[PDB]
Amino acid sequence: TNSTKKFQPFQQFGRDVSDFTDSVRDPKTLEILDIAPCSYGGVSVITPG
C-alpha cells in the first residue's frame, strides 16, 4: 500500500519493533511502500458433536 514516510537516500528498508520489514523503497521507480501480512482475524467453529 501507499505510505507517507520519506527518508534520506542512504536508507532502503524499514524495520518495526519485532524486526519485520514494514516499509520499503522501490526499484524501477522511486516510491515508498508499506507491506502488511494478509493473514488476519480469528476463526472459531461450532459443532453439535
Partner: protein, 31 residues
C-alpha cells in the same frame, strides 16, 4: 616552495567540557 614562519608562540593546551555533542547515525535502516 612552501613558506616557513620565523617565530610563533607555543601552543596552549586549555581544555573545555563538551555537552552532549558528537553523535552520528550508526545505521542505514529506517526506524
Amino acid at each position: 616552495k612552501c613558506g616557513t614562519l620565523s617565530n610563533k608562540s607555543p601552543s596552549k593546551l586549555t581544555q573545555t567540557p563538551s555537552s552532549r555533542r558528537g553523535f552520528y547515525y550508526f545505521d542505514d535502516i529506517f526506524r
